[PDB]
Design a protein around this ligand. Structure first.
Ligand SMILES: Cc1cn([C@H]2C[C@H](O)[C@@H](COP(=O)(O)OP(=O)(O)O)O2)c(=O)[nH]c1=O
Ligand SMILES: Cc1cn([C@H]2C[C@H](O)[C@@H](COP(=O)(O)O)O2)c(=O)[nH]c1=O
Ligand SMILES: [Mg+2]
Lengths: 203, 195
């Protein structure tokens, strides 16, 4: 059971993942969680983070270069994810493939029907062989509240987080992805969602 | 001993790799060779080539992104390089870390003493762990002779400036000692000089 948690920056994903893990375990299911990008476990991830903070020359200026590094990070995580799914009943991922599609489209002012979304789909699911998630849960939230959360919980904000319009468009692209079942079945929830009920719903 | 053969497209690196290897073997030394980018064996390498052919949107428009891909390709070969270095007296690499410094600087109109070349050293050698070559052999060729024999290959201006950064990397001893040679260099004398 592979579950992916998606959403904009400051949406509260970490928290949702926490509550959901407990609920699942409460219902006796073994849970494992993994977050992307894998800071500290991937050079591709680390360079991506440093790039979002202005480092590495013109790296961050390329939408596809950034998407590639995140995709390369997940690719190096294929055996890790398969290993988790084998050792636990529920594997929960804080951010996954859909993140790349939502942000890349948003940075290019494209929607779910744009080239970037389709490109991410082919690259990660078809070529890099990333395991399709059984569930993609979009934690939808107020753009203002999310923006403020990042501002408060800030370590300094990167170039994506300081881009209020990028965040709004990313929220919108996410909604389109969820509505059309991009990459599988989605579940849209709010911050005030009941863990136990959500868990019972997903599993 | 780890040896890297550097040079622009059309310099004749493969031929030199072949001759130098035969020379070392004749001198009673085992030799293994490896070529970069590892097209067909690396995803980073393949995406880079594809990007150089107009694929993957705006990826190729970024100098550092392209540079990062070639470096990640080399990173994936560290274990292979370390295995060769343990098994053979001489390991010859057709294109290595200096290629990234040369092409990146050339794309940015920088010189061997600039930011990009310094960046490549900080990334590949220390962060990624690529062994620093004992010798970097530059098969120097003028733009005219090279021109006589993707986005990069098609750019003569880029090829010319790349040759220029190579000439400077060699003079400044970027990443270690260098040797400049021509496609007519005598294998035996070269092997004796590198021994
Ligand atoms: C995982 C991932 C993140 N991103 C974006 C979303 C975030 O702005 C940023 C970093 O991811 P994030 O999980 O927000 O990291 P941090 O812990 O540093 O806040 O990059 C992508 O564009 N694609 C991806 O595949
Ligand atoms: C290995 C490597 C190649 N390149 C380049 C030069 C070539 O134009 C292209 C592919 O190399 P190739 O022609 O030897 O197969 O990528 C870099 O810019 N940096 C590197 O580190
Ligand atoms: Mg974030």
């Amino acid at each position: 059971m592979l579950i992916a948690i998606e959403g904009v920056d400051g949406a509260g994903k970490r928290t949702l993942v926490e509550k959901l893990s407990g609920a699942f375990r409460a219902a006796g299911r073994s849970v494992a969680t993994l977050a992307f990008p894998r800071y500290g476990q991937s050079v591709a991830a680390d360079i991506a983070a440093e790039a979002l903070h202005g480092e590495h020359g013109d790296l961050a200026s390329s939408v596809y270069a950034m998407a590639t590094l995140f995709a390369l990070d997940r690719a190096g995580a294929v055996h890790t994810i398969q290993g988790l799914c084998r050792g636990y009943d529920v594997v929960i991922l804080d951010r996954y493939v859909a993140s790349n599609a939502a942000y890349s489209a948003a940075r290019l002012h494209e929607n779910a029907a744009g080239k970037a979304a389709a490109w991410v789909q082919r690259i990660e699911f078809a070529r890099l062989g990333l395991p399709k998630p059984d569930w993609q849960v979009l934690l939808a939230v107020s753009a203002e509240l999310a923006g403020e959360r990042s501002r408060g919980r800030a370590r300094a904000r990167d170039n994506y987080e300081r881009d209020a319009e990028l965040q709004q468009r990313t929220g919108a692209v996410y909604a389109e992805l969820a509505a059309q079942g991009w990459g599988g079945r989605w579940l849209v929830v709010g911050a005030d969602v009941d863990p136990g009920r959500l868990a019972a719903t997903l599993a």
